[PDB]
Amino acid sequence: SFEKWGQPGHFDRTLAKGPKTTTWIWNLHALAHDFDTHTSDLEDISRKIFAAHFGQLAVIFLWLSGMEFHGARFSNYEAWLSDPIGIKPSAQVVWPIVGQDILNADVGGGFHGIQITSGLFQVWRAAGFTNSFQLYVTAIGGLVAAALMLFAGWFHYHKRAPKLEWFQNAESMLNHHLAGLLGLGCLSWAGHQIHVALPVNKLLDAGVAPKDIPLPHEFILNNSLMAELYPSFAKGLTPFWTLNWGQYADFLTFKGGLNPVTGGLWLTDTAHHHLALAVLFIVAGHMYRTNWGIGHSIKEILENHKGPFTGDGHKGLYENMTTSWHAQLGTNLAMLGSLTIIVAHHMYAMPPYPYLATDYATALSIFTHHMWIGGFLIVGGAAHATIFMVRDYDPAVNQNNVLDRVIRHRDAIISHLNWVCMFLGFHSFGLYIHNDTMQALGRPQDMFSDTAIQLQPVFAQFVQNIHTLAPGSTAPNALEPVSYAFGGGVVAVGGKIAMMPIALGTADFMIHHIHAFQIHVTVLILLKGFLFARNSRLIPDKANLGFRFPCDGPGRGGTCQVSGWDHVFLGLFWMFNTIAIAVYHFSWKMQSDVWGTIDPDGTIAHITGGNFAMSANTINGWLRDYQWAQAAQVIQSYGSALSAYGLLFLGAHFVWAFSLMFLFSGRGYWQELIESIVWAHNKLKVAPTIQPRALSIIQGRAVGVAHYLLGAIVTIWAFFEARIISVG
Amino acid sequence: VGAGLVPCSESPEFIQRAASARNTTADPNSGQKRFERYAQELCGPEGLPHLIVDGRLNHAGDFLIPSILFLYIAGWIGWVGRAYLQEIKKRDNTELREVIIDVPTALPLMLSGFTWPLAAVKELLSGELVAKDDEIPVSPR
Amino acid sequence: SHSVKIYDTCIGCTQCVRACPTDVLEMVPWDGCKAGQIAASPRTEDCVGCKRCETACPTDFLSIRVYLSNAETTRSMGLAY
Amino acid sequence: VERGSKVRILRKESYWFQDVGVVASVDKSGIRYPVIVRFDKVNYAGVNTNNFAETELVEIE
Amino acid sequence: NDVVVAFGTPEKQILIEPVFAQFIQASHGKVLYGLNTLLSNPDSVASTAGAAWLPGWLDAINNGTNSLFLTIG
Amino acid sequence: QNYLLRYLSLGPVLLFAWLSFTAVLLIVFNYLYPDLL
């Protein structure tokens, strides 16, 4: 059964005939997945989505198991086990041929290779991993499960495929997922934690012979060692039968802070955390109505909430949330993006793994990675919102609803929005350049820091304060503050900082305000494309014509770039700016007044020396006092054994300029040059039958923006990777 | 071979580098050997050799035969490509097979590029390489 | 407003008259080919410059052209304000 | 030059000027452009078929 | 050049050397390279020509210490 | 059957095939005698 692949265009009737010109190639890679553009049926669509999801999960399992396997046979884990400080983890040993021989990343113990930065060993310092053979079995299990569920997808598409009413039970969906998936998985992981994790963590305090430490089978029914610690953990005393839980104060506690013997927090808090979450959203997810004639009729809740300003409230919204798919796609994407960036903005003050704040390399890598993904996908959420607007709507089921009530007064909204953006924009940046001029003008008293004209963000200070003294009264059964950047003592280990309180002076003001500024303009562009998607004050045929089209002729002057995804083009440029300066700010502060070295007096000698109070106020200072440090080694960071990785930062500029080439130029020029080369080739009887044709302007715009983004992000990650290598 | 360039045999800095010349590959003689192979050319103050291109037998073969090798292989590949293209059109399945290569036919054409130069010379003398300015109908202007 | 230009290659499929949203065309009686009625521009003053019309002209070297002038006004520029 | 003969073109502005096409249908009516020729090389959207006045065509063979 | 030097071995990297400008340089009358041609050959047929005050010009050009046709690479 | 090549001969898969062939070609001469200059 192999007679079927090499029949291209199997899904489209038009491009199935033959490749007249090169255009036929391009569209082949463009319409391979939007099968909503293939028929009007839906069960087929849903089945395709299921199978694709299974395939994605399969590649997930594959790559994670393979990365394990590399971690088992080519990673200095079990030597780095006994010492997580004096050894830097590595993997991917270099192949000894011409060109890659000097790149032996030797990290002590003779182990060459590649000094990695992804902190998987940190998980492998919490999971309590002794020997690589169990890990070998783990990879085998991962890959076999991958193949298993792939076979399952094949079966559920080719032999027994689900029916159509199987789709729209969002009630049972929420119930099953919320409760069974999340709660059961979380409580199972907590059970694994208490049984194995903290025992071996105890056993990792003084060199207690890791492999000699017994295996879980020595604790499944062997409660003796389990009765050594935690006297209540004899069996459990099972006082839950007696409803008494005071005995369990041994392991299931509440400390809430840094544990200076683990490089992370107190794991017991995380275990009790997971317990509480498990049962909490179990009883939550038991809410909605199902097959027992009991529960909320959720399509009536939204009917109730209306009023004077509401119009008619949230009436008629489920046809949108189930009949169409792009809606759900967009909203869930936006939510995930936001969630991810708060995760990023979160796990640098509460490190949840062992040896995190003490390891000053994996932190910002993880941070920036997740932060980039967040935006990079929330813009896509907004794009799919717009594609819903153009693909799915209804004039009938959308009378006066809270939806329709904005599309009727969009002009006021967007006008006031533009107003706000202009205001904030110059109110911040022109102020900045004003201070710039003053410093360059021998008028230093007209500066704006503490030593000059004043402004102080009292609100952040007061909120941090009221957070400082929280325990005792707001948190009686709590020992230490939630973090130590708000308040508390400077927590550390060795000559190496873990967390100190962070200071907010004057420079914070304009930075946060320009953050808000760019977010405002981003929303402006995206929402503008959103509202003005179907009908503009000049183009009343937009939705009547599509959302992916270049222009509408030189009428009314010009009209090029009047679709919506060009709006999201401009938006993605802007969000690039946003996140770039955001990571600039984060890195510079957390290397300027949070991180460095320490003396026996707890004397934090930071890396840079507090440069914001000195230079992060004028533009010329911002280039001097940031990239002077961020590159002064990359010029010479090559030229020895553990340096030879000449980085492609020198290389990314080229792709950047090659990028911008595509933007500024039209296409007819290239078409004519093509025709001349064709003339020559035809004169020498080598004319390619398939007649080449230049790119379409939207295609060229896309490749230009793609190359632009690629070059920029490659440049910046090269920058701070080498910068951390210079200190980590 | 003038311009103030010392022979790579007796350039002191050349052997100075050669001493701790970082032996690249998995064989200890790698570096030293190559430096020994670099005595024929003539170094300079930079300690590294420049190449002279004149047909002058001091460095003639160090540039001529690679050029001729490239000409050989480029002629072969261009010749076999043009021949394949010419052949395809006598099938009336032109753009069907433009993406599906007919291997049982694509092989012997590749294997039969042995005598491309002189055969091409023949097609030059026979005039079997160009079509006529007006017969070629590709309209300019 | 702008100027319109007509030719002889009008086959008479009349896809342009159904494409222009600006009412600047009409098929006046002709005799030459099987068309018998050839397109023309009677109401140029409402020309817009969208030139969606010749994109609807299938004839080789499409039979209609528009010479985009310079005497624009509030009508030719198309403003609701 | 009959129905099914290969001829080149004399019309100057033609995209296939001097190019050879086959006379698909010999019309000879009162229209100024009787001859219907078919090509395979594509201009805009493939107008490989067109009409001309046969006072603008010349055969090859 | 970039990759070859990016491995630590610069000797595996190509160095060209222009000589046409060298020949024209000496042929105008430069002696630095010692080719004895056309005012580097003080006895050729044209070696009794040029300016009728070419001695000072020769003192100047031989003194390539200033910006007068500097060597190349 | 042997029909697989009928459905393996696509060009793209054949591209990478030929390119990798030529690549290992270039390697072996650079792998066996990378010591001739």
Ligand SMILES: CC1=C(/C=C/C(C)=C/C=C/C(C)=C/C=C/C=C(C)/C=C/C=C(C)/C=C/C2=C(C)CCCC2(C)C)C(C)(C)CCC1
């Ligand atoms: C984020 C992320 C990630 C991760 C993920 C994860 C980590 C997940 C998780 C998941 C999980 C963690 C899951 C779990 C699950 C579980 C469950 C779902 C359970 C259930 C259970 C049950 C069902 C039970 C049953 C039973 C038994 C067993 C006995 C008898 C009785 C009964 C029947 C009850 C990754 C890397 C991928 C990617 C990136 C991102």
Ligand SMILES: CC1=C(C/C=C(/C)CCC[C@H](C)CCC[C@H](C)CCCC(C)C)C(=O)c2ccccc2C1=O
């Ligand atoms: C270069 C360029 C072209 C040229 C058009 C094309 C199609 C050039 C593409 C050339 C080929 C398709 C690139 C192939 C890339 C591969 C690396 C080539 C490998 C081929 C061999 C290995 C077989 C445009 O048509 C254009 C249009 C509008 C705005 C900007 C531009 C623009 O910048």
Ligand code: SF4
């Ligand atoms: S211009 Fe086009 S649409 Fe108008 S009559 Fe002629 S062929 Fe028909």
Ligand code: SF4
């Ligand atoms: S732009 Fe074209 S379609 Fe519009 S009025 Fe002018 S001629 Fe008619």
